[PDB]
Design a binder for this molecule. Sequence first.
Ligand SMILES: NC(=O)c1ccc[n+]([C@@H]2O[C@H](COP(=O)([O-])OP(=O)(O)OC[C@H]3O[C@@H](n4cnc5c(N)ncnc54)[C@H](O)[C@@H]3O)[C@@H](O)[C@H]2O)c1
Ligand code: NA
Ligand code: NA
Ligand code: NA
Ligand code: NA
Lengths: 491, 494, 491, 491
Amino acid sequence: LLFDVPEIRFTKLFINGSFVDAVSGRTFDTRDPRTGGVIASVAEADKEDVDLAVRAARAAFDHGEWPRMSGSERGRIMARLADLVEEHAGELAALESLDAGKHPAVTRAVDVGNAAGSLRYFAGAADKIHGETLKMPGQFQGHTLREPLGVAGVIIPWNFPSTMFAVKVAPALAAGCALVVKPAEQTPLSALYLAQLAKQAGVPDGVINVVPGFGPTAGAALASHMDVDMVSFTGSTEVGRLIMKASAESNLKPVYLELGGKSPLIVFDDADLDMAVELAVGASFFNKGEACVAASRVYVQERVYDRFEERLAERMRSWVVGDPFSDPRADQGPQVDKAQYERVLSYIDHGKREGATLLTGGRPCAPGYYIEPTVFTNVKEDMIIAKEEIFGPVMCLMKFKTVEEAIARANDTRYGLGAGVVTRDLDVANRVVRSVRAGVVWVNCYFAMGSDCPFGGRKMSGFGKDEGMHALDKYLAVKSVVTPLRASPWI
Amino acid sequence: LLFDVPEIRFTKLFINGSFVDAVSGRTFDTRDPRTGGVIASVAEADKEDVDLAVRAARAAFDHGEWPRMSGSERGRIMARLADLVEEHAGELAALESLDAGKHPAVTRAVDVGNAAGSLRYFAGAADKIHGETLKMPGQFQGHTLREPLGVAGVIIPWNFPSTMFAVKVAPALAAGCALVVKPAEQTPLSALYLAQLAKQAGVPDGVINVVPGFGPTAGAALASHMDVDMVSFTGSTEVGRLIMKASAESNLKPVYLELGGKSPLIVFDDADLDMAVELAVGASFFNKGEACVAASRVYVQERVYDRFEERLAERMRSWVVGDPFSDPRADQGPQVDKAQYERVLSYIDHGKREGATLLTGGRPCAPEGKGYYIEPTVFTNVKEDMIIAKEEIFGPVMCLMKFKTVEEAIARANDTRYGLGAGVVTRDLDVANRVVRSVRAGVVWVNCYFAMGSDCPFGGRKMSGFGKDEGMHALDKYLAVKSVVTPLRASPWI
Amino acid sequence: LFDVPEIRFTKLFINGSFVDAVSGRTFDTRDPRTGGVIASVAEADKEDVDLAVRAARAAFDHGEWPRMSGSERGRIMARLADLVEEHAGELAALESLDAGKHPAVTRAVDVGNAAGSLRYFAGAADKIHGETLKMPGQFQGHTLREPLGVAGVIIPWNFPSTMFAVKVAPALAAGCALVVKPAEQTPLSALYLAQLAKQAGVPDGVINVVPGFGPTAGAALASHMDVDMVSFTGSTEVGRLIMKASAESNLKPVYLELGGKSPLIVFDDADLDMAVELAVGASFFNKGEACVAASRVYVQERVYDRFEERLAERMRSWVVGDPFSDPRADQGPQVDKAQYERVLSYIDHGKREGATLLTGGRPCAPKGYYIEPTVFTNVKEDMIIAKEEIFGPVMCLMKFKTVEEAIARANDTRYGLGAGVVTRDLDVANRVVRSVRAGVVWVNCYFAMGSDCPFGGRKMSGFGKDEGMHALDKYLAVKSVVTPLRASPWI
Amino acid sequence: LFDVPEIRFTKLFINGSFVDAVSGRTFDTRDPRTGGVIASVAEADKEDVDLAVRAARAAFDHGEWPRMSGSERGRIMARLADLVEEHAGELAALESLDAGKHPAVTRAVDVGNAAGSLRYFAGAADKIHGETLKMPGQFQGHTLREPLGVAGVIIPWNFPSTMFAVKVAPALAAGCALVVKPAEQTPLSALYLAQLAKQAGVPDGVINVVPGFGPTAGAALASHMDVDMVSFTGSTEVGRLIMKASAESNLKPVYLELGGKSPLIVFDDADLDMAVELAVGASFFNKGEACVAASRVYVQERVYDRFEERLAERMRSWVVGDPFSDPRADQGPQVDKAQYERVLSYIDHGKREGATLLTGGRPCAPKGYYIEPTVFTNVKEDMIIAKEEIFGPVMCLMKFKTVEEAIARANDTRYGLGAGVVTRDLDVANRVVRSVRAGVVWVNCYFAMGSDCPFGGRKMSGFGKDEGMHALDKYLAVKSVVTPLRASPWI
Ligand SMILES: NC(=O)c1ccc[n+]([C@@H]2O[C@H](COP(=O)([O-])OP(=O)(O)OC[C@H]3O[C@@H](n4cnc5c(N)ncnc54)[C@H](O)[C@@H]3O)[C@@H](O)[C@H]2O)c1
Ligand code: NA
Ligand code: NA
Ligand code: NA
Ligand code: NA
């Protein structure tokens, strides 16, 4: 082939520094979306396995070395882990690509690079986490201590396996927490590989526990656990409801939700059309639309709409959908599995039926679970395709007249994850940025953030931040301490 | 009477700057725990009234002046409100005290003073709320904007009505949010009075909406509302479950929970026994134990235990339970209502039945009547597994226990589902540091209790909740953090 | 017409009292509209500075002010802001008569910013924070942000009330005691403000005002062995003497707010009518007696000719006259005879070096120290008028071709206080803002800041920030506190 | 025994190369154990400083370093930290022979703190933040935290590696170019560190090392017209000259880390054996050649007699000798002949003024600059030995009655660098900590800080912080940016 197919080494659960089978001895299969065939038979975690992993994390936090280590010591190990992710980038990229149906070179440069980058950023945060010394109403000394919380429960999706693992694990490790990670059943391989690398880096046993299994089994047990201090969840808005219920029905642990989106990209009259078209293609079709922040709604101002529409249709004619391991041309790979592939085509079918015009794509291909990049035109705001998260290579292209109209239409969603603005006008950019109810707003770009940039939703896209110093908050216990002072010359 | 009984002026719902009746025309009574008699007939808000209030708050945020005003402008209006609370402190104190069964002088100095203080602290925060300018991975400029969130839903308890109103309203107002406040049905008068004073201060119509009603009606409607951006809740751990469910079943709005507690107070052998006893009395019995952070569990080291126990029983002999409006000597007033009175009496009876020793109180009292008066109760020979040791009584009940080691004191302090507050009484700096850092509580007082100020963040750990009330930390729940990224062309530095 | 105020405060303000100088000496303050004596002010020297420093030392070491809670200090500070607002008209008329200003402009701008600075720091007082640090082992570390002690303040004549408030407000909030040396040309506002502070409840000894001459009273304060810091605002040349005075005494930290030669850059992009109106205000506000005045105006070649013609036409309706008797008055007299002659000397020098006189360039007096607003065209960068701070109503109007040229020319100064950019282009705005070595950069506006905005120079314009939470730093002592921990379950 | 290192780097380090001085002049560095020449080091003067400043100017204005991302600068700094760790033994041996230190103490303390400071700031590089401000109307305001430019560094001979790192690390992270003037007595470590920084990937011109004499090389750097700031560490008397050099040149901000006369307070409740052992280390670490050394020890009257006796018996087992040949060696020789004679002069002066000699007070040498650790009893506060910085193994042991007396006596100094408190009482500890006017206060310990802990003087011990996120401020330009907003839905 073009890229070397990796050898599957880690298929068991990772509890207390060891690779172990499920209590039941049950396995679940992970498949290659390029072929639809079984890659590996992975240990199937259930309630009993989650209990064992939570017990291992509890012992690691309450009695283990990790919270008792200096921030410098924790950051030292976290950096060695970042070094290992970088050293084994190629292997990890192919392993994630084969499991998630993506391009190994894109996975290495984007996914693995961001994973290593997130680990490095928090390794540098570990020795500089600060609390405050407060201003008191009298002869008192007050301060806050920013303590490790305890046992962190992590539930993540299948679209960015390595990045999802790092973005949750990294701020939790720097905070001094012990972890229980439940990766998505569709792509469980990267999380098990990363667990082995953390062991090699010097992360103490019990600090990182990986429990691959099904959501209503393993995931629900973790979200409902009486000895888990917090839960950081990334997935659908509908499953987010169940995570909130699981906490309410258990120990009322704080819940942090990174949910779906229906991200709008607004293109103005003054934009360079060639850059705006190229930006829109990337924004909508990166990772075959299996991106939470994907620009599923593209808004183009009436004066340049016809030109944009023509240039977009022309650009899509040179776009290649195929096997990233055998085809060099390949711009897009297959969808994660059978269930997702049926779901996108059903939405394409819904789009056709409700009266939307098909500009490009709208049908399956195969040189596997391949769908061509779809662009819907003459889209009404009330349409299913306009409102619902498709999570596939589907773009809704719309026309607008005013700045006011662009703002109101961008905000006409239950969601509020990301948004984009393409304009040269400083006053238009400022107005649009400040008026769109989204957690992240890109101006004349898309996706670009870095680990210093906090990422989180607004409205039904969730709450809580991943990345930035902001990410640490969910993993820390803020403790206020008050004592009287005797004859202090100042207060 | 020693304190003037106030004139009840505000009994209707406060929606879009006006005092209006409920859509149903229904009322609910608020009673005086000193007599058991009706003070006023308050408008009963339901689903329809909460919608009206949320629509008023939505119009005020989306199209009104409040989020469009500068932090300085919001700050001046907030300081005028703080000035009004101070100017009308006596009337508000009398009103809250008659509704809650409090001492008017204590309420003025503590409750009203903290309410005015929280409004002032956030008035000063309004013109200095900052976001960041970020460090980017290349030729990019990144920044965060700390925007007003939108419509803030507030659900609060009956124990500190004025303080609860201010502690939620003040950071929200400073953040530039519009509010919908659901006060507890037992004490709804203060929230209504405060709403009128905000109108006088210059708070625009629709920014503060007060909807008194029942929890499963008006409270559930607010927590389940599809157009409410966040919910800040203060109340029991059991109702907290329903707030989280209401969000999950609606628009998944962020929820912030300020829940119950079973706060431990640890006294070591090196303590001054007279100060430690006097501190324990205040920590346990302030506001007749109707305090979330009340030291319901007192742990005294074995060498000084017998002396502490004797000094505590002696101190309680001079404690006065009675009418704060007619008796000057009164240290403690009646419990909020009949329901709370029976609930505390049931826990005392349960305590006796499980084998705990009654050191003092444990029975009803006090003046010629009439009134929900309970003697401050101290339980001795309490086992950790006992109901009285684990459950929140929310009455004048203290569980007195003995301990040997620092390690034992820590483990026993942590033997709770809760983690709101805790106290340490010691002269030893190393013991104080170890106990402070080992007790899983949101607030730890060393050689004092309650003292915080508005710069001090307050929030639970474990089943006592999450999220901070007070401090600059309080603003977070009312703000939307927006990350903004743009490329840079030929910047000489990054 | 505006009512001429009655002068009531002419003595030194030491330990809560209005006292005469030890010598019994006075110095005259004059009205630039007539050149006549307004009042005879007590002349402070070394002995009076000693008395004021001793009063501040007693107030800090033994007095109430540092022992009060931030909340208590905040209420007193806010009462002072309320008083400045209540007496705004009287203070504006007083400052206007003394400095040759328009009483309505002084009320809206100068007095409003003074009241605003006091309010901002009143709200800062109860929320000043230190940190709880991340330690290398079983240790607990924290920083305390303590009041420093005795703050020495030396300020100029151009913005008397604003200068007083901008130094006094963060010092007051920090819990410091003060010794203020106002400029001899305008000493009246400071003495009025001192009385207002006493009425607000500021304890005796906390605010001491010692008007006098720079080499006498000013040098004594800068050289004092018991002064903990010096905040200086004035010329770059006097700044040298403040640094020497500290070096020759107790090596107290020095904070310098020096001169400027601020550039305003206008692109082809700009609305010419708004750009001309902005330039007029930026160059001629307070008769060019502004440190941040746009003394250099750069206009891109394509719109230069139109800008130049519109500017000359705009200046034809500009009124220079008595602000107390003429309603149309846009500009008052220059502060005094010395400043008046210094500006005329620079105008004459400009003519002699070959620069074209577009408008003004000669005295008016409708007798008074009135100078016509001056615009110089065909200005070479090497010219005296192009490089030196004139501090009068003089604008140097220049032409440019490229963004690169505009940046290089803006930076061709020893100074770096302020700068301005007029453009609709977001990328041009970002590039110029980030490339111009100035403390403040205004985009499509000028002067606008507010008390949350830190103000300070770069290069020879100084160092240190006035305004913002940043202004508190110079008045605080950061104390690091370290103790071991015994068996802490986390670090 | 320990291995004597090879001397490899003896030339100036300018623009990535080891070059000779323009004059071709050299100065000798000597071994304090023998008094013999170790190496002949290139002697920098005005011309060499000019060359180094020009190299730093080109590196900042046109080079890669300020244009690289914080992440990029952080990886290079972490590679440098890794190299300092890899070559720790060689560097410790190099610094030890040059400064008269124990190679094992230099490795664990000096080299460990140097590597630790580089690592802390490598982790700071990708997370330096400015603010987005609260505006007085329809305006958007923000601050940018820019690299300042050319940083001038002047450091002492006592902690060569630590001094180099503590100045270079925040400056590097900030994106500055540097010119380092190390002390003439110990120039070797700085040249070795410069070579390691080249190996790590620090671009040419970013780190320039100019060993030379103070009034020549040092004065030229402090007076340079193209240097943006100066961070100085040394004596209080030389600090005066650094302030004068900036005042007489370009008025660049100056940051001073000066001398001290640090008090250690021991109360009646202390464990005498721990308090004696702590005092021994606090006074005699690095043969009293420590700025923060506890040169004044105050013991409460009830435990004074026991403390005094235990201290004299503890000193009987203390070994002064060659650390390279004697394993028992607790103390090495004084840096040079000049320092040796200066300490002996102070000991002789102490005897002359009436102070009692408890231990030491005479030379030892098993020849080569060895002085016995000296303890003076019956010391009056007015004595020379009580007030002046000896900078040798000399301790003044005094008795006190009250907490109030301990505070007033601790504060009876022109200095305010460090202080220590030994007590079990939480209220006494808090009162002493908050009442002693010192930048650092250790409670029941000494020296312990870590790189998160800011270090700086108060009073005549200076101003400005080394270490912590606080250390970055001096190397950054804070730029305020203001623009109007059109129809923003919120402000
Ligand atoms: N924010 C700022 O940066 C800012 C603001 C306003 C004005 N300014 C600057 O102020 C200058 C105009 O004011 P000025 O003419 O009053 O300046 P100046 O330098 O002559 O004097 C300023 C102050 O210093 C005193 N002074 C003079 N000689 C002294 C000495 N030897 N020792 C100690 N103090 C001494 C004066 O009495 C006065 O109080 C201009 O250069 C202008 O740019 C700067
Ligand atoms: Na798969
Ligand atoms: Na009631
Ligand atoms: Na005058
Ligand atoms: Na040497």
